[PDB]
C-alpha cells in the first residue's frame, strides 16, 4: 500500500505539471492527494488519512466550483491557454482560487496544515521505504508546482480569452456556496483537528529539516514553478523533450493500455469464441 | 421488552456523572431537553393510546411444541413412515440449531460493539463459547451437502465415532 | 426575452 | 462542414491546410500572445520564402519535409475549440437536438398548447409537398448521363422553386436548442 | 440513546424525501432544486447534532434498523455502524453536497 | 478557390429559407396555452421545518423507541469513558484517583 | 444582477464582488497571522531535538575502557 | 443572463472591425462586399490568417473547406449567421 | 559521440534578450536560483555563527 | 539522517539496525538499573478505553487530557496545558528511545574495540 | 444594441507588441495583426500582475485586523 | 427488404467475373475490392477494408450515420463493432508506438527497481522500539489470564 | 526522429509516401471513388428527403454485414489444418488447464483435511 500510493502520487503529479485543461489538472491533483492518503494508510496512521479525506473534500469541492465559475463565465472554455487576468476581471473567484491553492499546498494553519503536514512528519520520522519517502516529498513539491501553474496561467499575465466579455459572477447562488466552502477551507481543519479524540499518537521530537520539510519543499516548488512560468513567458522556443511528452500524454498509459487491452480482448472474442 | 437477559445478556450500564468545568452552556443538553419536550411527549402519548387500544382488544398466541417422535437410530431401513417422522424431526432440530448459532453470533457482535477497544480482553468467555458452539456445529452438520439428511448426519457421526474409537485404541 | 419553440418527443403517452 | 469534400486536395489546399495547422500548434506552444505573434510572423516568412518555387516537384518535396517537421514539432496536447471535434463541448447538445418529425407524433392536447406554430408547421409541410416533386424533376434533369459526379447540388433555376433536397438542411435542429 | 439514532435515520429520511417528491408528480408545481438544497442543508444540521454528541462523549453506535433475511446460520440485517469516520464524513459530505447543490442550481441553468 | 456560382446561389437560397424557418420557431405572446408569502424565516423556512423535518421526526422516533429498543441487540453502544474522579450514576461509587505524579517539570 | 457586456475594454466591476473577495482574502491572512502569533509550532516545534553526540557515557552506562 | 444572443449587424460590425484592424487592408477601401484578392489584393496565406482571426474572435473553428470557400466579409458574415443560427 | 556544436551554436546567438548566463534553458535558471538560495542563505548562516562566536552564553 | 549514510556507506558492523534492540544485556555497564515505573494501571486503562497503541508510559497524561476534553467539551480550546503535558511526556519517551539506541550503538563500538584488542 | 469602441484607439506604443515589432523589423519583417491583438495590453488590462500581488491580496487589511485583535486581547487581559 | 441472394454475401470469388460481380454487389471498384484470403474462415467474398478505426474519419463531414462516421451504402468493415468511436482507436499518435511502449516499460521497471532498492535500504530514525508496559500489554492483547507469561522488563534510561 | 506506425497507431494520411508520389491512375481512382460516393449520397438524400416516406431507410450494407457475420460463416467455412489446430486448442486447452488447476487444488485440500493439518476456523456454512 505504501509503495502503490507513493507511485500513484508521483505519476499523477508528473501528469499534472503539463496538463492544460484545468479540470484535468485538478483531477490529477485529486489523484495525487489520494495517493498521499494511500501512503498514510501504508503507514499505521488511518486517522490521519481520514482527516486528509475531510480536508481534501473541502479543497477539491471549492477548487472545482471556482473552476466551474471561470468556465461558465468564459463560455465553456476549459483550458488555461485561453484564460488570463482573472485576478482583475473576477476578483471573488480569483481570491477563492488562491485560497484553495494555498490551502492545498499546505499554507500553515489552514485546513491542509492539520493533515498534510502531519503526514509529511510521519513519513519523515517513521521507518518506511526510502524511495517511497523521496518520491512522496517530490510529489508534495510538485503539488506546489502545479498549483503555481494554475495560479499563473489563470489568475496572472495578460488576457487570452475571446474579446466579448460575458463575465457575471454576481449571482448569490454562485457567491454563497463558494463563501461557505472558503469558510470551511480556512477554519474547518482547525476546528476538526482540535475536536479529534487523541488516537494514533504522533512524534514531535525531530530535527528542523525534518520538521519544516513540507513547508520548505512547498516554497521551493512554488519558486521553481514561478521561474519555469517566467521562462515560458520569455520569448524563446525550446525543443520538446520525452519527459514533457511523457508527462503531457499521461505517461502513455491511456494510449497503450486502452488500445491494446480492448483490441486483443474483442479480437479474441470475435475471432475465437463466436466464430471459431 | 419481550426479550430477557438470560438469553440476551447485557452488563449494567456505568455512565459517569456530568462534571462541567467550563462555563459555556451545553447545546447537547439544550437540544436533548427540547427534543424530549417536542418529540418524545407526543410520540409516547400516541403509543399510550395505541397500547390502551390493545388492552381493550387483547388476544393471545401460543408457541407450538412438538413431542419427540422415535429417533432414526431405532428406525428400520426401508420403512418410510417413521423415516419421514425422524427426518422432519431432524429438520426441525436443524432449523433450531441454525437459530441457536444466530443468537451466539449476535451475542459476540454485541460484545465487540459494547467493549469497543477492549474487545480483545472482555469478550474472551463468549469467544470461547462461540468457539465451542462452532466446533460442535462442525461436528454435527458440516460437510453434509445440499441434500443434508438425518441419515447423512448419522453416517457422519458413525464415521467420526469410529475414528475416535480407533484413535482411542492406541 | 425572445423565446423560441423547443422540439420535444411525445411525453404525453 | 457546409461544403462537401472533393476527390483530392490540391497542392495549394495542402499547403494552406499545413499553414493553418502549423499556426494553431504554434499558438498552442507559445501560449503568450506577443510570443505567438513573433513566431507566427517567422513561420509566415518561411512560407513566403518557399512560396515562389517553380519546379513543383521541389514544392512537393518541401511539403513532405515540412509536414515531417510538423509531426516532429507538434504540440502533444494542442488547443481545440470547445465546439470543434475533440473539444470539451463537442456534440454536447445532441441529446437536445430532437428532430422535427416528433411533432407529427404529438397528441392533439400538446398540439393545442401551440396552435399558431403548428399552423405554420403544416404550411411548411405543404410547401415541402409541392417542392419535393418539383425538385425530383429538377434533379433528374440535372444528372449527367455519364462521367464525373460530385456531391454538390444545384440551386433552383427558376422563380417560385426551391433548391433540391432543402428539407434536411433548412429544418435541421438548432445548435443550442435549449 | 434515542436522539442519536433518530438523528441518523432523519438524515436518511430527509435524503430520501426529494426522491419521493420527484416521483410524486408535483415537481411541475414546486421548485425542486431549491427544495432539495433546503433538504440537504437540514440534513447537514441534523448531521451536526451527532457530531457534537460524539465530540462530547466519544460513543460509537451500531444500529440494526431492519432484518432483511436469515439463511441458515447467516443473518443478513440492515445495520449501520455510526462511527467516528461515519459521523465526520457524513457531516463533511453533507456540507459539501449542499454547496454543490446550490452551485448546480446556478450552473446547470438553461438545461 | 471561392464559391462556384452553382454553390453560391444554392447557399444564398438555402440560408434565406433557413431565416424563415428560424423566424417561424418564435412563439406568440399567448404561447404556451396553459389550460401568504410572509418572509423566508417565518413562512418559507418554518413550514418546511414543521412538515419535512418535524413530521418525519415523530415517525422515526416511534420506530427508534417502540420498534428498536424492544428488539434485544438492535441499538448497541460502546461503554462511555470513565476517568478517575468520576461518579457512576447507576451504581453510585467513585473510582479512586491516580498516583502522585512524580514528574511535573512541565 | 445582470450587467452590460463589453467588447474589448475592462468590464465594469461591481462593489459586492470586490468587497467580498477582499474580505475573504483578509480573513484568511488574519487567521494565518493570528495562529502564527499564538501557536507557532509550524517551525521547530517546541521541543528542541537533542544531539545524541553530546550525551555522556556515564548516563548511557557503557563499561569504561 | 449570460451568453447574449448574436445579431447580423453585430456580426458584420465585428468582422469589419477585425478587417479594419488588419494592416494590409486600408479601412477606407474596405467594404462588406470587398473581395480579398480581386479588389483588396491579398493572397491565400492572408486569407488563412483572416479566417484564423475570425475563429479566434468568435471562439469556434471554421472547418478547412468552408475556410477556403469564404472570400469576402459578406460571405464570412453569412457563414457565421448560418452556423450560429442568427435569423435577425 | 556526434558533433552537436552547430546546433548548440544556434541556441545561443538568438538575440532574445536573455543574458549569456541564462540562454541555455530552464535548467540554467533553476541552477542560478539554486546558487542564489544557498550562497545568500549560507552567508546569512555564516554571520549568525560568527555572532554566536562573538557572544558567549 | 546521518546515521543512515554512515550505516549504508561507511560500516554496518558498528552501526546498528532497528530490529534487534537491545542486542546487549540491560545490566551490562549499569551497576543497578531500575525498572521503568508507570502511573496508570490496567483498570483505569480499561475504564478510559485507551487504544492499545496509546497504552504506553504516558497513559496517565492521556487520561488527564481526555478528562479535560470531556469536561470542557464546549470551548474545546481549553486543554492546551494538558496537551502540552502529554506531548512533553511523549517527547521524553522519544528521547529515552534515542538514548537506548545511542547506548547500544556505543556498545557495538565497544564490542568492535574489544574484538580488535583480542 | 451593443456599441463597439472606435478601432483607432488600438495602438502599438508602450507594448510588448512594440517589442515584438522591433524584433521583427530587425529581421525585415512586419506583423499585420498587432493592432488587432493590442486590446489585451491597454486600459484595465494594462498592468503587470505579480505573484506577490496575487498571494498578498488583502494582506494589508488582514494585518490591520490582526493588530486590532492583538490590541483587543491586550485590553481584555 | 427486397434483398435477394445475388445481393447477399456469397462464396469466395475465383474467376475475375465473380470478383467483378462481388465488387459491384459491395458497391466498390474492381481494383479496390480485395476479399479475405481463402483460408476457410467463413469470410467469403466480404472485402478487406483497411484496419482503421472510425476515429480517423473526417469529423467535419456530415456522414449519413454520424455516430458511426459512415455514409449510406459504402461497405462496412468486418470489425465495425470494435472499431467504433466508443471502442478501440487506431489514430496516429504524436509519438511512435514503440517509443511509448518502451517509455512505459522503462518507467515501470525503474519504479519497481527503486522500490526494491528502498526496501533493501530502509530509511528510519535513530530510535529503539516503542516501550510498552505490563509484559507488552499481555492481558490487553488477549493473553491467557490463568497462564503466567514470561516477564518482559523495560528499564529506565 | 522518425514516426513508426503501428496497427494501433496508424500512419498519417498526409505523412504516407503514396500521397506525394501520385499518378494519373491514382487520380482517376479517387475521381471514380468520389463518383460512387456521390451517387450513393444522392440516392440516400432522395430517400431521406422524400416526404411520402413513412418508414426508416433500410441499409443494404448493414444487412450484408449482419448476414456475413452471422449466416454466411458456416457456408464459407472449410476445414484446414490451421483452423482445426486452432479450434482444438481453443476448445480443449483452457479446459485441460483449468481441470489440472482445480484438480491439484482440490486434491491438496482433500489431502490436508484427511491428514488433519488444515483447520477450519469458523467455516460452518460452506
Ligand atoms: C438500502 C438501499 C436499497 C436500495 C439501493 C439502490 C442503489 C442503486 C440505485 C440505482 C438508481 C438508478 C437510477 O438512476 O434510476 C433512475 C430511475 C428514474 O430516473 P429518471 O432518469 O428520471 O427516469 C424518468 C424518465 O427518464 C422520465 O420520466 P419522468 O421524468 O416523467 O419521471 C416521473 C416519475 C414518476 O414516478 C412514478 O410515477 C412512480 C411509479 C411507481 C409508483 C408506485 C406507487 C405505489 C402506491 C402503493 C399504494 O417516473 C420515475 O421516476 C420512473 C418510473 C418508474 C419507477 C419505478 C420504481 C420502482 C417502483 C416500485 C413500486 C412497487 C409497488 C408495490 C405495490 O429512478 C428509479 O429507478 C427510482 C429511484 C431510485 C431507486 C429508489 C430510491 C433509492 C432507494 C430507496 C430505498
Ligand atoms: C501416423 C502416420 C501418419 C502421420 C501423419 O500424417 O500425421 C498427420 C495427421 C494430420 O494430418 P495433416 O497432415 O494435418 O493433414 C492435412 C492435409 O494433408 C492437408 O489438408 P487438406 O485440406 O487436404 O485436408 C482438409 C481437412 C479435412 O477435413 C477435416 O479434417 C475435418 C475435421 C476433422 C476433425 C477436426 C478436429 C479438430 C478441430 C476440433 C475443433 C473443436 C471442436 C469442439 C471442441 O483436413 C484438415 O483439416 C487437417 C486436419 C485433420 C485432423 C484429423 C484428426 C483425426 C482424429 C480426430 C480425433 C478426435 C478429435 C476430437 C473429437 C471430439 C468430438 C466431441 O496427424 C497428426 O498431425 C497427429 C494427430 C492425429 C490425431 C490425434
Ligand atoms: C509497481 C507495480 C505496478 C503494477 C501495475 C499493474 C497494472 C494493472 C493494470 C490493470 C488494468 C489493465 C486493463 C485496463 C483496460 C482498460 C480499457 C478501457 O477502458 O479503455 C478505454 C478505451 C477508450 O478510452 P480512451 O480511448 O482511453 O479515452 C477516450 C478518448 N476518446 O476503450 C474502450 O472503452 C473499449 C470498450 C471496452 C472493450 C471491452 C473491454 C473488455 C475488457 C475485459 C478484461 C478482462 C480481464 C481483466 C483482468 C484484470 C486484471 C487486474
Ligand atoms: C427503505 C428502507 C427502510 C428500512 C426500515 C423499514 C421500517 C418499516 C418496517 O419494516 O417496520 C417493520 C415493523 C414490524 O417489524 P417487527 O418490529 O420486526 O415486528 C415485530 C412485531 N410483529 O413495523 C413497524 O414498525 C410499523 C410501524 C412503522 C412506523 C414508521 C416507521 C418509520 C421508520 C423510519 C426509519 C426507516 C429506516 C431509515 C434509513 C433508511 C436508509 C435507506
Ligand atoms: C509547429 C511546427 C510546424 C512546422 C511547420 C514547418 C513548415 C515550414 C516549412 C515550409 O513552409 S516549406 C513550404 C513548402 N510549400 C511550397 O513550396 C508551396 C509553393 N507552391 C505554391 O504554389 C505556392 O505559391 C502557394 C503558397 C501554395 C500558392 O498559394 P497562393 O498564396 O494562392
Locate L133 and state its grid cell: 508496559
Q: Give me the helices (H) in I1-57, please.
A: 5-8, 26-54
Can you state the angle between helices I26-54 and A213-233, rounded to 10 degrees? Answer: 140
Tell me which residues of chain J, numbers 26 to 85, contact chain F at a CB-CB cutoff of 8 Å: 37, 39-40, 44, 47-49, 60, 63, 66-67, 70, 84-85
* Those residues with Cβ within 8 angstroms of residue D8's Cβ, 6 or more apart along the chain or in another chain: M27, M30
Structure resolution, Å: 3.3
> For the sheet containing E74-82, what is the strand order?
E74-82, E61-71, F75-77
Element (H, E) at E67: strand E61-71
Q: Which atom of ligand 4 is nearest to the CA of F63?
A: 31
Alpha-carbon distances, residue M126 vs B105, B145, B155, G61 (angstroms)? 16, 9, 19, 60
Longest dimension (CA), chain F: 106
Pocket of ligand 2 (CB under 6 A): M 79-81, 84, 87-88, 91
Q: Which of H39, H43, H66, H82 is catalytic?
A: H43
* Those residues with Cβ within 8 angstroms of residue A225's Cβ, 6 or more apart along the chain or in another chain: A144, A145, A146, A148, A149, A152
Nearest to D39 by CA among E51, G12, A157, K20: K20
Closest alpha carbon within chain A to M70: A275
Query: How close is the Cα of L54 to the center of ligand 5, in Å?
Result: 30
Nearest to D73 by CA among D37, D22, D38, D36: D22
CB atoms within 10 A of CB A59: 29
Locate M26 and state its grid cell: 491514382
Produce one character per residue of D117-153: b if its CB has 16 or more CB atoms within 10 Å, e if not: bbebbeebeeebeebbeebeebbeeeeeeeeebbbeb
The verdict on a CB contact (< 8 Å) between I18 and A236 is yes
Cis ω for the linkage preceding B71 (within 30 of 0): no
Query: How close is the Cα of E20 to the center of ligand 1, in Å?
Result: 8
Element (H, E) at E80: strand E74-82
* Those residues with Cβ within 8 angstroms of residue B56's Cβ, 6 or more apart along the chain or in another chain: none
Return phi, psi of residue G63, to 5°.
-65, 135
Distance in angstroms (rounded) separating the CA atoms of residues D88 and D96: 17
DSSP tag of G51 = -
Nearest to A95 by CA among B105, D119, K59, E106: K59
Alpha-carbon distances, residue B126 vs E72, E75, L142 (angstroms)? 21, 19, 13
Q: Which residue's entry shows cell 535548467?
A: I27
Contact D158, F6 (CB under 8 A): no
Nearest residue (CA) to ligand 4, atom 34: F60
Element (H, E) at D14: helix D11-30
Distance in angstroms (rounded) separating the CA atoms of residues K16 and D34: 6
The beta-carbon neighbor of E102 closest among A62, A173, A192 is A173
The verdict on a CB contact (< 8 Å) between D17 and H64 is yes
Tell me the nearest-neighbour CA distance from F86 into chain B, angstroms. Answer: 6
Distance in angstroms (rounded) separating the CA atoms of residues A113 and K58: 21
Half-sphere exposure of C12 (CA within 13 A, CB side): 12
Element (H, E) at J51: none
Closest alpha carbon within chain A to J53: A200
Tell me the nearest-neighbour CA distance from H81 into chain F, angstroms. Answer: 9
Locate I11 and state its grid cell: 541556441
Cis ω for the linkage preceding A3 (within 30 of 0): no
3-state helix, strand, coil in chain E (%, to 5): 65, 20, 20
Query: How close is the Cα of E23 to the center of ligand 1, in Å?
Result: 7
The verdict on a CB contact (< 8 Å) between B32 and E60 is no
Interface membership of B131 toward L (CB under 8 Å): no
Question: E76: helix, coil or strand?
Answer: strand
Half-sphere exposure of H76 (CA within 13 A, CB side): 33
Element (H, E) at E70: strand E61-71
Nearest to M52 by CA among I57, D129, F32: D129
CB distance E23 to ligand 1 below 6 Å = yes
Distance in angstroms (rounded) separating the CA atoms of residues A266 and A197: 53
* Burial status of residue D88 (CB atoms within 10 A of its CB: 0-12, 13-18, 19 or more): middle
DSSP tag of A270 = I
Task: Give D83-140 as a 3 state SS string.
Answer: CCCCCCCCCCHHHCCCCHHHHCCCCHHHHHHCHHHHHHHHHHHHHHHHHHHHHHHHHH
Residue H61, sorted as left (phi over 0), alpha (psi -120 to 50) or beta, turns out to be: beta
Locate H87 and state its grid cell: 435569423
Half-sphere exposure of F15 (CA within 13 A, CB side): 20
Q: Which residue's entry shows cell 507538434?
A: D74
Do the strands F75-77 and E74-82 form a parallel or antiparallel pair, or are they unpaired?
A: unpaired
Q: How many CB pairs under 8 A join D and M?
A: 58
Distance in angstroms (rounded) separating the CA atoms of residues A69 and E4: 38
Residues of G in contact with J30 (CB under 8 A): 61
Task: Give chain M as a 3 state SS string.
Answer: CCCCCCCCCCCCCCCCHHHCCCCHHHHHHHHHHHHHHHHHHHHHHHHHHCCCCCCCCCCHHHHHHHHHHHCCCCCCECCCHHHHHHHHHHHHHHHHHHHHHHHHHHHHHHHHHHHCCCCCCCCCCC
Contact L73, M47 (CB under 8 A): no
Contact G45, A211 (CB under 8 A): yes
Interface membership of F43 toward E (CB under 8 Å): no
CB distance A165 to ligand 3 below 6 Å = no
CA M14-M18-M23 angle, 5° bins: 120
Distance in angstroms (rounded) separating the CA atoms of residues A60 and A176: 17
Contact J101, L127 (CB under 8 A): yes
Ligand nearest, relative to CA of residue D85: 3
Distance in angstroms (rounded) separating the CA atoms of residues J84 and F104: 12
* Those residues with Cβ within 8 angstroms of residue J35's Cβ, 6 or more apart along the chain or in another chain: L153, L154, L155, L156
Nearest to D20 by CA among D78, D94, D104: D78
Distance in angstroms (rounded) separating the CA atoms of residues H8 and H81: 7
Determination technique for this entry: cryo-EM
Distance in angstroms (rounded) separating the CA atoms of residues E67 and D102: 49
H43 is catalytic: yes
Tell me the nearest-neighbour CA distance from L94 into chain D, angstroms. Answer: 6
CB atoms within 10 A of CB B106: 17
CA A268-A271-A272 angle, 5° bins: 70
Amino acid at each position: 500500500m505504501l509503495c502503490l500510493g507513493a507511485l500513484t502520487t508521483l505519476f499523477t503529479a508528473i501528469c499534472a505539471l503539463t496538463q492544460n485543461d484545468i479540470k484535468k489538472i485538478i483531477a490529477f491533483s485529486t489523484s495525487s492527494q489520494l495517493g498521499l492518503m494511500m501512503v498514510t494508510l501504508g503507514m499505521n496512521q488511518p486517522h490521519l488519512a481520514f482527516l486528509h479525506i475531510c480536508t481534501h473534500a473541502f479543497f477539491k469541492a471549492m477548487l472545482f466550483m471556482c473552476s466551474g465559475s471561470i468556465i461558465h463565465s468564459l463560455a465553456d472554455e476549459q483550458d488555461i491557454r485561453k484564460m488570463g487576468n482573472i485576478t482583475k476581471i473576477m476578483p471573488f473567484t480569483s481570491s477563492c482560487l488562491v485560497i484553495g491553492s494555498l490551502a492545498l499546498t499546505g499554507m500553515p494553519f489552514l485546513t491542509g496544515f492539520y493533515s498534510k503536514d502531519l503526514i509529511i512528519e510521519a513519513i519523515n520520522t517513521c521507518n518506511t521505504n526510502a524511495w517511497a519517502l523521496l518520491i512522496t516529498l517530490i510529489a508534495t513539491s510538485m503539488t506546489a508546482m502545479y498549483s503555481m501553474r494554475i495560479i499563473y496561467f489563470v489568475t496572472m499575465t495578460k488576457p487570452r480569452f475571446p474579446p466579448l466579455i460575458s463575465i457575471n459572477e454576481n449571482d448569490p447562488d454562485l457567491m454563497n456556496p463558494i463563501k461557505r466552502l472558503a469558510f470551511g477551507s480556512i477554519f474547518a481543519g482547525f476546528v476538526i483537528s482540535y475536536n479529534i479524540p487523541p488516537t494514533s499518537i504522533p512524534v514531535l521530537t525531530m530535527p528542523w529539516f525534518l520538521k519544516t520539510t513540507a513547508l520548505i519543499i512547498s516554497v521551493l516548488g512554488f519558486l521553481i514553478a514561478l521561474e519555469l512560468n517566467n521562462l515560458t513567458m520569455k520569448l524563446s522556443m525550446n525543443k520538446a523533450n520525452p519527459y514533457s511528452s511523457f508527462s503531457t500524454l499521461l505517461g502513455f498509459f491511456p494510449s497503450i493500455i486502452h488500445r491494446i487491452t480492448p483490441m486483443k480482448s474483442l479480437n479474441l472474442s470475435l475471432k475465437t469464441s463466436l466464430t471459431l | 421488552d419481550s426479550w430477557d437477559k438470560d438469553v440476551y445478556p447485557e452488563p449494567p450500564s456505568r455512565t459517569p456523572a456530568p462534571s462541567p468545568q467550563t462555563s459555556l452552556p451545553n447545546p447537547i443538553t439544550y437540544l436533548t431537553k427540547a427534543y424530549d419536550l417536542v418529540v418524545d411527549w407526543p410520540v409516547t402519548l400516541v403509543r399510550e393510546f395505541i397500547e390502551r387500544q390493545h388492552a381493550k382488544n387483547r388476544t393471545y398466541y401460543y408457541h407450538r411444541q412438538y413431542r419427540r417422535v422415535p429417533d432414526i437410530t431405532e428406525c428400520k431401513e426401508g420403512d418410510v413412515l417413521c423415516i419421514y417422522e425422524a427426518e422432519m424431526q431432524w429438520r426441525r432440530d436443524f432449523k433450531v440449531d441454525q437459530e441457536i448459532m444466530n443468537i451466539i453470533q449476535e451475542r459476540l457482535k454485541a460484545c465487540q460493539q459494547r467493549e469497543g477497544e477492549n474487545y480483545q480482553q472482555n469478550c474472551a468467555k463468549e469467544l470461547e463459547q462461540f468457539t465451542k458452539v462452532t466446533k460442535a456445529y462442525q461436528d454435527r452438520y458440516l460437510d453434509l451437502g445440499a441434500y443434508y439428511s438425518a441419515r447423512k448426519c448419522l453416517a457422519k457421526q458413525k464415521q467420526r465415532m469410529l475414528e475416535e474409537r480407533k484413535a482411542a485404541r492406541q | 426575452g425572445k423565446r423560441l419553440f423547443v422540439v420535444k418527443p411525445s411525453l404525453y403517452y | 462542414a457546409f461544403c462537401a469534400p472533393p476527390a483530392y486536395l490540391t497542392h495549394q489546399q495542402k499547403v494552406l491546410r499545413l499553414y493553418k495547422r502549423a499556426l494553431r500548434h504554434l499558438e498552442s506552444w507559445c501560449i503568450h500572445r506577443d510570443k505567438y505573434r513573433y513566431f507566427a510572423c517567422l513561420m509566415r516568412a518561411r512560407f513566403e520564402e518557399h512560396k515562389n518555387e517553380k519546379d513543383m516537384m521541389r514544392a512537393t518535396q518541401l511539403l513532405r519535409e515540412a509536414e515531417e517537421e510538423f509531426w516532429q514539432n507538434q504540440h502533444p496536447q494542442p488547443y481545440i475549440f470547445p465546439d470543434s471535434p475533440g473539444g470539451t463541448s463537442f456534440e454536447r447538445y445532441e441529446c437536445y437536438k430532437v428532430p422535427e418529425w416528433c411533432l407529427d407524433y404529438w397528441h392533439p392536447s400538446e398540439k393545442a398548447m401551440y396552435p399558431d406554430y403548428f399552423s405554420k408547421r403544416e404550411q411548411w409541410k405543404k410547401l415541402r409537398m409541392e417542392s419535393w416533386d418539383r425538385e425530383v424533376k429538377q434533379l433528374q434533369e440535372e444528372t449527367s448521363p455519364d462521367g464525373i459526379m460530385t456531391e454538390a447540388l444545384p440551386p433552383a433555376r427558376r422563380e417560385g422553386d426551391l433548391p433540391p433536397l432543402w428539407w434536411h438542411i433548412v429544418t435541421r435542429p438548432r445548435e443550442r436548442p435549449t | 440513546m434515542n436522539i442519536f439514532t433518530t438523528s441518523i435515520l432523519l438524515i436518511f429520511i430527509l435524503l430520501l424525501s426529494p426522491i419521493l417528491i420527484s416521483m410524486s408528480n408535483l415537481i411541475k408545481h414546486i421548485n425542486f432544486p431549491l427544495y432539495t438544497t433546503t433538504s440537504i442543508k437540514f440534513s447537514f444540521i441534523i448531521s451536526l447534532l451527532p457530531l457534537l454528541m460524539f465530540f462530547h462523549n466519544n460513543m460509537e453506535y451500531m444500529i440494526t434498523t431492519w432484518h432483511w433475511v436469515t439463511m441458515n446460520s447467516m443473518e443478513l440485517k440492515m445495520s449501520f455502524k455510526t462511527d467516528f469516520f461515519s459521523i465526520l464524513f457524513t457531516s463533511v459530505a453533507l456540507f459539501v453536497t449542499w454547496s454543490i447543490m446550490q452551485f448546480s442550481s446556478w450552473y446547470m441553468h438553461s438545461d | 478557390s471561392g464559391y462556384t456560382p452553382d454553390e453560391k446561389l444554392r447557399l444564398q437560397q438555402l440560408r434565406e429559407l433557413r431565416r424563415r424557418w428560424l423566424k417561424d420557431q418564435e412563439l406568440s405572446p399567448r404561447e404556451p396555452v396553459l389550460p401568504k408569502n410572509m418572509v423566508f424565516k417565518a413562512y418559507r423556512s418554518s413550514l418546511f421545518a414543521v412538515s419535512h423535518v418535524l413530521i418525519p421526526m415523530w415517525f422515526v422516533h416511534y420506530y427508534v423507541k417502540y420498534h428498536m429498543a424492544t428488539k434485544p441487540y438492535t441499538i448497541v453502544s460502546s461503554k462511555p469513558r470513565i476517568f478517575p474522579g468520576d461518579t457512576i450514576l447507576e451504581t453510585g461509587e467513585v473510582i479512586p484517583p491516580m498516583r502522585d505524579f512524580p514528574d511535573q517539570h512541565h | 444582477v445582470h450587467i452590460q457586456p463589453r467588447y474589448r475594454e475592462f468590464p465594469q466591476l461591481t462593489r459586492s464582488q470586490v468587497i467580498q473577495g477582499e474580505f475573504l482574502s483578509s480573513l484568511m491572512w488574519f487567521w494565518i497571522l493570528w495562529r502564527f502569533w499564538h501557536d507557532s509550532d509550524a517551525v521547530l516545534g517546541h521541543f528542541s531535538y537533542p544531539d545524541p553526540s553530546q550525551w555522556t557515557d556515564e548516563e548511557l552506562g557503557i563499561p569504561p575502557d | 443572463s449570460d451568453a447574449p444572443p448574436l445579431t447580423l449587424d453585430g456580426i458584420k460590425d465585428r468582422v469589419l472591425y477585425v478587417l479594419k484592424l488588419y494592416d494590409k487592408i486600408d479601412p477606407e477601401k474596405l467594404s462588406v462586399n470587398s473581395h480579398f484578392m480581386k479588389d483588396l489584393g491579398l493572397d491565400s496565406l492572408d486569407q488563412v490568417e483572416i479566417i484564423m482571426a475570425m475563429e479566434d474572435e468568435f471562439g469556434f473553428e471554421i472547418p478547412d473547406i468552408d475556410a477556403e470557400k469564404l472570400m469576402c466579409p459578406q460571405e464570412i458574415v453569412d457563414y457565421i449567421a448560418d452556423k450560429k443560427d442568427v435569423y435577425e | 559521440f556526434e558533433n552537436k556544436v552547430p546546433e548548440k551554436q544556434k541556441l545561443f546567438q538568438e538575440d532574445n534578450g536573455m543574458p549569456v548566463h541564462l540562454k541555455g534553458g530552464a535548467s540554467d535558471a533553476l541552477l542560478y536560483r539554486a546558487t542564489m538560495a544557498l550562497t545568500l542563505g549560507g552567508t546569512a548562516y555564516a554571520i549568525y555563527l560568527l555572532a554566536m562566536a562573538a557572544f558567549p552564553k | 539522517g546521518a546515521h543512515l549514510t554512515r550505516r549504508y556507506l561507511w560500516d554496518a558492523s558498528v552501526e546498528p539496525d532497528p530490529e534487534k534492540i537491545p542486542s546487549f544485556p540491560p545490566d551490562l555497564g549499569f551497576p543497578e538499573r531500575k525498572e521503568r515505573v508507570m502511573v496508570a494501571t490496567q483498570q483505569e486503562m480499561m475504564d478510559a478505553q485507551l487504544t492499545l497503541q496509546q497504552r504506553d508510559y504516558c497513559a496517565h497524561y492521556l487520561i488527564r487530557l481526555l478528562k479535560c476534553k470531556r469536561d470542557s467539551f464546549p470551548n474545546f480550546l481549553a486543554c492546551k496545558h494538558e496537551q502540552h503535558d502529554w506531548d512533553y511526556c511523549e517527547h521524553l519517551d522519544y528521547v529515552k528511545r534515542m538514548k537506548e539506541f545511542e547506548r547500544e550503538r556505543r556498545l557495538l563500538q565497544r564490542k568492535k574495540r574489544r574484538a580488535l584488542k583480542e | 444594441k451593443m456599441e463597439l469602441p472606435d478601432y483607432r484607439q488600438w495602438k502599438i506604443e508602450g507594448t510588448p507588441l512594440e517589442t515584438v515589432q522591433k524584433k521583427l523589423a530587425a529581421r525585415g519583417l512586419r506583423d499585420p495583426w498587432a493592432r488587432n491583438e493590442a486590446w489585451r495590453y491597454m486600459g484595465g488590462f494594462a498592468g503587470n500582475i505579480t505573484f506577490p500581488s496575487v498571494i498578498l491580496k488583502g494582506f494589508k487589511w488582514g494585518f490591520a485586523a490582526f493588530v486590532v485583535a492583538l490590541g483587543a486581547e491586550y485590553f481584555l487581559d | 427488404f427486397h434483398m435477394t441472394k445475388d445481393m447477399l454475401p456469397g462464396s469466395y470469388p475465383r474467376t475475375p467475373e465473380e470478383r467483378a460481380a462481388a465488387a459491384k454487389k459491395y458497391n466498390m471498384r474492381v481494383e479496390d475490392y480485395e476479399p479475405y484470403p481463402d483460408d476457410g474462415m467463413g469470410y467469403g467474398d466480404y472485402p478487406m477494408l483497411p484496419n482503421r478505426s472510425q476515429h480517423e474519419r473526417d469529423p467535419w463531414y456530415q456522414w449519413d450515420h454520424s455516430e458511426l462516421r459512415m455514409n449510406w451504402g459504402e461497405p462496412i468493415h468486418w470489425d465495425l463493432d470494435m472499431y467504433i468511436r466508443n471502442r478501440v482507436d487506431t489514430s496516429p499518435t504524436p509519438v511512435s508506438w514503440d517509443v511509448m511502449c518502451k517509455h512505459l516499460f522503462g518507467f515501470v521497471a525503474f519504479m519497481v527497481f527503486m522500490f526494491w532498492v528502498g526496501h533493501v535500504f530502509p530509511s528510519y530514525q535513530p530510535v529503539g522500539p516503542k516501550q510498552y508496559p505490563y509484559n507488552n500489554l499481555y492481558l490487553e492483547r488477549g493473553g491467557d489470564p490463568t497462564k503466567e507469561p514470561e516477564p518482559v522488563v523495560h528499564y529506565d534510561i | 526522429s522518425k514516426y513508426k506506425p503501428a496497427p494501433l497507431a496508424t500512419l498519417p494520411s498526409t505523412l504516407d509516401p503514396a500521397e506525394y508520389d501520385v499518378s494519373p491512375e491514382t487520380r482517376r481512382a479517387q475521381v471514380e471513388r468520389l463518383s460512387i460516393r456521390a451517387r450513393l449520397k444522392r440516392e440516400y438524400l432522395l430517400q431521406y428527403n422524400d416526404p411520402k416516406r413513412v418508414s426508416h431507410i433500410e441499409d443494404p450494407a448493414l444487412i450484408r454485414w449482419t448476414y456475413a457475420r452471422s449466416a454466411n460463416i458456416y457456408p464459407n467455412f472449410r476445414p484446414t489444418p490451421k483452423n482445426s489446430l486452432l479450434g482444438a486448442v481453443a476448445g480443449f486447452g483452457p479446459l485441460i488447464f483449468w481441470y489440472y488447476v482445480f484438480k491439484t487444488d482440490r486434491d491438496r485440500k482433500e489431502r490436508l483435511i484427511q491428514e488433519g493439518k488444515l483447520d477450519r476456523k469458523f467455516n460452518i456454512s460452506y
